[PDB]
UniProtKB/Swiss-Prot annotation, chain A:
The modification Phosphoserine is found at S51, S76, S105. One of its GO terms (cellular component) is cytoplasm. Belongs to the eukaryotic ribosomal protein eL13 family. It comes from the Eukaryota. Pfam families: Ribosomal_L13e. There is a cross-link at K173 (Glycyl lysine isopeptide (Lys-Gly) (interchain with G-Cter in SUMO1)). It is found in: Cytoplasm. The keyword Ribosomal protein applies. It comes from Mus musculus (Mouse). This is Large ribosomal subunit protein eL13. GO terms for biological process: blastocyst development; bone development; cytoplasmic translation; translation at postsynapse; translation at presynapse. Component of the large ribosomal subunit. The ribosome is a large ribonucleoprotein complex responsible for the synthesis of proteins in the cell. GO terms for molecular function: structural constituent of ribosome.
Curated annotation (Swiss-Prot), chain B:
The gene is Rpl28. Component of the large ribosomal subunit. The ribosome is a large ribonucleoprotein complex responsible for the synthesis of proteins in the cell. Component of the large ribosomal subunit. Keywords: Acetylation, Cytoplasm, Isopeptide bond, Phosphoprotein, Ribonucleoprotein, Ribosomal protein, Ubl conjugation. The lineage of its organism: Eukaryota, Metazoa, Chordata, Craniata, Vertebrata. This is Large ribosomal subunit protein eL28. It is found in: Cytoplasm. The modification N-acetylserine is found at S1. It comes from Mus musculus (Mouse). One of its GO terms (biological process) is translation at presynapse.
UniProtKB/Swiss-Prot annotation, chain C:
It is found in: Cytoplasm. This is Large ribosomal subunit protein uL15. Pfam families: Ribosomal_L27A (PF00828). The modification (3S)-3-hydroxyhistidine is found at H38. Residues 1-29 have a biased composition (Basic residues). The lineage of its organism: Eukaryota, Metazoa, Chordata, Craniata, Vertebrata. The modification N6-acetyllysine is found at K46, K54, K109. The gene is Rpl27a. InterPro entries: Rbsml_uL15_N, Ribosomal_uL15, Ribosomal_uL15/eL18, Ribosomal_uL15/eL18_sf, Ribosomal_uL15_CS. Keywords: Acetylation, Cytoplasm, Hydroxylation, Phosphoprotein, Ribonucleoprotein, Ribosomal protein. The modification Phosphoserine is found at S67. Residues 1-36 are annotated as: Disordered.
From Swiss-Prot, chain F:
This is Large ribosomal subunit protein uL4. The chain holds residues 107 to 158 of 419 of the full protein. Citrullinated by PADI4. Component of the large ribosomal subunit. The ribosome is a large ribonucleoprotein complex responsible for the synthesis of proteins in the cell. Coiled coil: none annotated. It is found in: Cytoplasm. It comes from Mus musculus (Mouse). Belongs to the universal ribosomal protein uL4 family. Component of the large ribosomal subunit. May bind IPO9 with low affinity. Interacts with RBM3.
Length: 205, 122, 147, 52, 127, 52, 104
RNA sequence: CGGCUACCCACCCGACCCGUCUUGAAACACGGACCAAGGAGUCUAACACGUGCGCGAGUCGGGGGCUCGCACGAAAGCCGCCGUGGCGCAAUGAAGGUGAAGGCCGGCGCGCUCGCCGGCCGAGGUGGGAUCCCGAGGCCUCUCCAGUCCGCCGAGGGGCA
RNA sequence: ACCCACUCCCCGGCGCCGCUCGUGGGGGGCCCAAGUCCUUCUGAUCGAGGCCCAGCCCGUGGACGGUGUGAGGCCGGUAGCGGCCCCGGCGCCGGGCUCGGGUCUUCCCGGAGUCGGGUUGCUUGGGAAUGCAGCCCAAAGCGGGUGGUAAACUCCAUCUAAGGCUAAAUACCGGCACGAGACCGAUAGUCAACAAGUACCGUAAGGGAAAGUUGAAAAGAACUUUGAAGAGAGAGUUCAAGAGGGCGUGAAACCGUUAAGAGGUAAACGGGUGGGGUCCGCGCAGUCCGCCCGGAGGAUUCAACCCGGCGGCGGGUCCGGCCGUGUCGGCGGCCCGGCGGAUCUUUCCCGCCCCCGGGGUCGGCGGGGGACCGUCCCCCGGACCGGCGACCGGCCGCCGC
């Protein structure tokens, strides 16, 4: 079976595969159906923007992607409470709420409540009769626009601190080194052993 | 850009008929029938051609003006010569010898003019 | 292109390019990698050494995200920032050094390669190699650890 | 290279007074082989499958 | 050019729907043009054929200026019969010859209560 | 039915072919040798006004 | 064309015609059958938009982000002038147009 | 009158019935009574090499989205803060992990089987190596004078892959 | 349960006007433009044209049917085309329910033969056993599950299982309709293009075919004669019966007849001739063409040369102007010009933030404004090519009139 020289192959075609083969011959039709559905939904909900519910600022969990930031599902109950709006009214306002998410960092809490405040300040809703408060006499001629695309108020485009340039300090030549990381790893590896040794030494005293 | 156009026209082009072992280029402005670079009349900046007159006597000579290129409306000047068998033969020869104007294919133009005059004689 | 394949020029030849003595039988030697240890051992040991057996310890539920650590070299350390930064540092108006953060570009560890320019730099990375750390300090640069 | 001017023609057939310059796309390398390759490989996209 | 995605250009489908058309569609298919002096009078181009109207052959073998009258409209065969357009058999008996209604031009129509309505509807639609 | 019907082409090669065709459409020889009747045409790139 | 105002209606019934847009240029319509050199009729705006859609060798295209005009291989594609130039024929060899056929 | 041939006939010579298994086939080895139609190396996934094309330490929108409803449009055009991602740009260990710049000059400490310092270009050296450069020497109407004019080369140098 | 400052609304029928994005859904009928001249043909849709506004329409030149090959002769097609009938929602006139938000004080807060363990099977990539199941053992409330290697000690992170409902993107070789095809073209394509799951076969489960083409129109052969009839000889229709009721076209194997040739080593076959025959080209003692010159007779305008004159070629002055390739320059189009840049300007602004409404840059965050950088827009001044970018003035030398 093998030849002179070649990469050994293990094709996973030993099963009866020809009776289950998904050909994507309906891909243009599926894309057309999805586009027509999007257009119909946007036309039915015209005063509200596409992908209406605002989504919070979400950091990636894993260490591979924790350097960038992305969108999420909904704002936390703590963020809603700091914003000052009720939990159940945010859904009809247009704010997606995620009750399962917790808040561990005030650095993200302040960013989320600031995003919520910006959304609330930019938001303009329509009443049934002018007897409802928190509105104006004229609704900016359909708010200058009916529907928004790719994010209700703002995407999650990444920003970065500048830290343009600075003068090197005196001890920076001997501040850090590879030996520093090596010592850190050695201490993290031998932390508990040293504690047990100190314990058994104090036991003898 | 004569060779650049010839590298495209030498094949995959219209007017070309090679049903038998010989090939023919058959352009509206061409002296011989060979599909060659030295006889093609559509790619050069200077081209001479002869044709039987539409009235029924005489020979029309088409010359590439070269004054305005890429303007096929006035890119060709057409003259009519209706003389005896020798006066036209000498005028066509002078038209290529006095001016530089593509000194080759002079014999080709002369042979085609004589051959069409032979058919116009009856 | 069937008109360009070989089967067209094989019409009229009874064996169809497979010989009269040994015909084209359906899997005459075996199906797949059959007999990797016998009657194919010569090929399997000449062209695929180390194929049979186990070597290392097993790691259940391995995640490729933990071992994610791209490396950047010193010759590429200047391709991350723009070109005007290098000329502004070479102008040398004072003892100020540009800061080149590799975390933005996507590298976590900096590895050592030679031929560095004589301009001081401030590098911020999670990991540094010994050779790179000595070579950046031999020019007057600084290394900053991040997390 | 040289990019001359091309006059505009009116709806009656004569040349208008305005004039526009020749774009740089018309001086691109003429590649019949590349054109034929692209045409051959792109014409196979609109065909429908057939089977027994 | 065709643009409605609900009408077909298939030759086989068109032939099938034409050969198996119901009787109320065969009467619309079997339509004949009107004469020039009558077209300007009625402001209509064509009109279906009935049993009482007169007609004049314009093309075929039995063509000419002799005015004729229809006697049978054979919807099944998409044909009409004329009393004077006939032929002799082997034994000498007469039999009508079939000519398609598209190859014949009408000169006279039976003024019926429904025919006038169809005429005025076509005229108002042509406007 | 799962035969490889469609073939994908690089966008750069697609644009290369388009520019090649546009540059070839501006030469009178290449368009005359295709079969078009351009003997009476004043200018080969026919640029008309916006009224059309 | 560009910025349709009803030209498709006026050009949709002429046989052999083809309707094409500047923003959507199709090779199947520009070079039918695999042969280049199809006769084209442009508009003023359609002709002015080409410099911004494809760009020149100096500046890149504005509509397309990372696209530039293809590079040009032979700067002078005329072999006749190059072979007949004095610089080439200055250091050439003798023609030597003798046949030297077979001698009996 | 001239005419090869897909017409027929005769003589002279040579001439065993085709296909494949076999060292050996015309065989007393197998299949074929004859004729017409159909009939057998295809397609998918993966791998290796070679070739053509485009870009180039980058490359690829095949997955989705956008423009206008479209016969040709199940096409084509675009995304640019959609490059997430695949391949390559870094390898070596079972793993914890580590992870690629040489050469010249001068000085000091015992220039010590000896480290450091300062300046420079910056991927070492040897033997081959297409090509290129320099080049003694001689090659063009009577003469000392010349830049083109006729026009190759001994030897030597930096040396692609 | 107090305190505080607030909210008058929502949900189910009934009559109507105007719309809903392709301009909501379903159904019937209608809507542009030659059949005009001439000539082929059995038959026309074939064949050139319809005055200088290109014979007419075109948002309708797809397709079908019609004696063949139609944009205009006929349903049909384009058209936010019209008129008619039926169904569903958006706004408005009776009827029944009807206290939300925050702080503080007090109380309440949970699913059991189930988790888990032992054991035995099936399964999983899941390995000291991922999941399921059978038997046995079978609990707790600072508890229990999980944290990918079994076990003990300690800490940490996450969730609240043994109760339930829910459209979305997803799949569809059956069903009801539709559209399309680089597929098949009657031994192919579904077994089945046709009275096909039919004829037929086996007791039954079940197996399962073959089979399209007259003619434009039957106009399917009247009538006379032979034969009892099958059939045939005349005649008749059709352009055609050489299309006569499984009848378009009509090959090979095979067979009959006619003509030619040949015949004891079966026939056949390759090399080279001869004889006969069909047929082909020529008209066979009589057939080669074109150029120049010297002679023999006639008729014509031009050519030599000059003049009028247009059209093209060539370079000199690059002349009055055109643009390409580079360097400055008006710092001018930066506000009545564009992009990018981890290059800047915290003595610029706006919204936050630290310290003592206000003050302090003491520092930081997001957005906007503007300064320098590399690519682009106009005139002047010049550097090179005047080249496939081109005009006039003047000249030599051509062509036709
Ligand atoms: Mg092998
Ligand atoms: Mg199997
Ligand atoms: Mg062989
Ligand atoms: Mg082989
Ligand atoms: Mg073998
Ligand atoms: Mg063997
Ligand atoms: Mg079909
Ligand atoms: Mg064989
Ligand atoms: Mg054997
Ligand atoms: Mg044997
Ligand atoms: Mg044999
Ligand atoms: Mg045998
Ligand atoms: Mg035997
Ligand atoms: Mg036998
Ligand atoms: Mg066959
Ligand atoms: Mg990536
Ligand atoms: Mg027809
Ligand atoms: Mg038609
Ligand atoms: Mg009509
Ligand atoms: Mg527990
Ligand atoms: Mg716990
Ligand atoms: Mg643990
Ligand atoms: Mg563990
Ligand atoms: Mg539950
Ligand atoms: Mg549940
Ligand atoms: Mg669903
Ligand atoms: Mg096929
Ligand atoms: Mg059958
Ligand atoms: Mg009888
Ligand atoms: Mg027949
Ligand atoms: Mg028959
Ligand atoms: Mg005989």
């Amino acid at each position: 079976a093998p030849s002179r020289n070649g990469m050994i192959l293990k094709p996973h075609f030993h099963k009866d595969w020809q009776q289950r083969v998904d050909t994507w011959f309906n891909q243009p039709a599926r894309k057309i159906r999805r586009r027509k559905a999007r257009q119909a939904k946007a036309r039915r909900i015209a005063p509200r923007p596409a992908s209406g519910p605002i989504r919070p600022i979400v950091r990636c969990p894993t260490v591979r992607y924790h350097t960038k930031v992305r969108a999420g599902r909904g704002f936390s109950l703590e963020e809603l409470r700091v914003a000052g709006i009720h939990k159940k009214v945010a859904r009809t306002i247009g704010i997606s709420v995620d009750p399962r998410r917790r808040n561990k960092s005030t650095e993200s809490l302040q960013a989320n409540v600031q995003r919520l405040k910006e959304y609330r300040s930019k938001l303009i809703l329509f009443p049934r009769k002018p007897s409802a408060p928190k509105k104006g006499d004229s609704s900016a001629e359909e708010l200058k626009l009916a529907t928004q695309l790719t994010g209700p108020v703002m995407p999650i485009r990444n920003v970065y601190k500048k830290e343009k340039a600075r003068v090197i300090t005196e001890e920076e030549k001997n501040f850090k080194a590879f030996a520093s990381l090596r010592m850190a790893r050695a201490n993290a590896r031998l932390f508990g052993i040293r504690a047990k040794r100190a314990k058994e030494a104090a036991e003898q005293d | 850009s004569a060779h650049l156009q010839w590298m495209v026209v030498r094949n995959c082009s219209s007017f070309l008929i090679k049903r038998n072992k010989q090939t023919y280029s058959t352009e509206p402005n061409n002296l011989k029938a060979r599909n060659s670079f030295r006889y093609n009349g559509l790619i050069h900046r200077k081209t001479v051609g002869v044709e039987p007159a539409a009235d029924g006597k005489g020979v029309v000579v088409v010359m590439k003006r070269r004054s305005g290129q890429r303007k096929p409306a006035t890119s060709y000047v057409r003259t009519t010569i209706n003389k005896n068998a020798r006066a036209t033969l000498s005028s066509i020869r002078h038209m290529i010898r006095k001016n530089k104007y593509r000194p080759d294919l002079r014999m080709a133009a002369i042979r085609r003019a004589s051959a069409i005059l032979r058919s116009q004689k009856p | 292109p069937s008109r360009l394949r070989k089967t067209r020029k094989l019409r009229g030849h009874v064996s169809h390019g497979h010989g009269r003595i040994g015909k084209h039988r359906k899997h005459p030697g075996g199906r797949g990698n059959a007999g990797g240890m016998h009657h194919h051992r010569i090929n399997f040991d000449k062209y695929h050494p180390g194929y049979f057996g186990k070597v290392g310890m097993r790691h259940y539920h391995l995640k490729r995200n933990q071992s994610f650590c791209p490396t950047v070299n010193l010759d590429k350390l200047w391709t991350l920032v723009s070109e005007q930064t290098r000329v502004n540092a070479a102008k040398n108006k004072t003892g100020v050094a540009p800061i080149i953060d590799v975390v933005r570009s996507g590298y976590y560890k900096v590895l050592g390669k030679g031929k560095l320019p004589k301009q001081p730099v401030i590098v911020k990375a999670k990991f540094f190699s010994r050779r790179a750390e000595e070579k950046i300090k031999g020019v007057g640069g600084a290394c900053v650890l991040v997390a | 290279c040289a990019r001359p001017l091309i006059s505009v023609y009116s709806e009656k057939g004569e040349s208008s007074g305005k004039n526009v310059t020749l774009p740089a796309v018309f001086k691109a390398p003429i590649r019949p082989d590349i054109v034929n390759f692209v045409h051959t490989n792109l014409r196979k996209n609109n065909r429908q499958p057939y089977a027994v | 050019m065709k643009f409605n995605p609900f009408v077909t250009s298939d030759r086989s489908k068109n032939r099938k729907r034409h050969f198996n058309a119901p009787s109320h569609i065969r009467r619309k298919i079997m339509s004949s043009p009107l004469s020039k002096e009558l077209r300007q009078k009625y402001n209509v181009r064509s009109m279906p054929i009935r049993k009482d109207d007169e007609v004049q052959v314009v093309r075929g073998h039995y063509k000419g200026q002799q005015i004729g009258k229809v006697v049978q409209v054979y919807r099944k065969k998409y044909v009409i019969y004329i009393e004077r357009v006939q032929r002799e058999k082997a034994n000498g008996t007469t039999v009508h010859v079939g000519i398609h209604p598209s190859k014949v031009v009408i000169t006279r129509l039976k003024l019926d209560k429904d025919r006038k309505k169809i005429l005025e509807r076509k005229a108002k639609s042509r406007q | 039915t799962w035969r490889r019907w469609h073939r994908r082409v690089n966008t750069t090669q697609k644009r290369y072919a388009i520019c090649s065709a546009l540059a070839a459409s501006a030469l009178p020889a290449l368009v005359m040798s295709k079969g078009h009747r351009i003997e009476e045409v004043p200018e080969l790139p026919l640029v008309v006004e916006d009224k059309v | 064309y560009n910025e349709d105002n009803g030209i498709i209606k006026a050009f949709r019934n002429i046989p052999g015609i083809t309707l094409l847009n500047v923003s959507k240029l199709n090779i199947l319509k520009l070079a039918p059958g695999g042969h280049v050199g199809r006769f084209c009729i442009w508009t003023e705006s359609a002709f002015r938009k080409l410099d911004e859609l494809y760009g020149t060798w100096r500046k890149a295209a504005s509509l397309k982000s990372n696209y530039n005009l293809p590079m040009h291989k032979m700067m002078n594609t005329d072999l006749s002038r190059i072979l007949k130039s004095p610089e080439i024929q200055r250091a050439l060899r003798a023609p030597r147009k003798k046949i030297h056929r077979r001698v009996l």
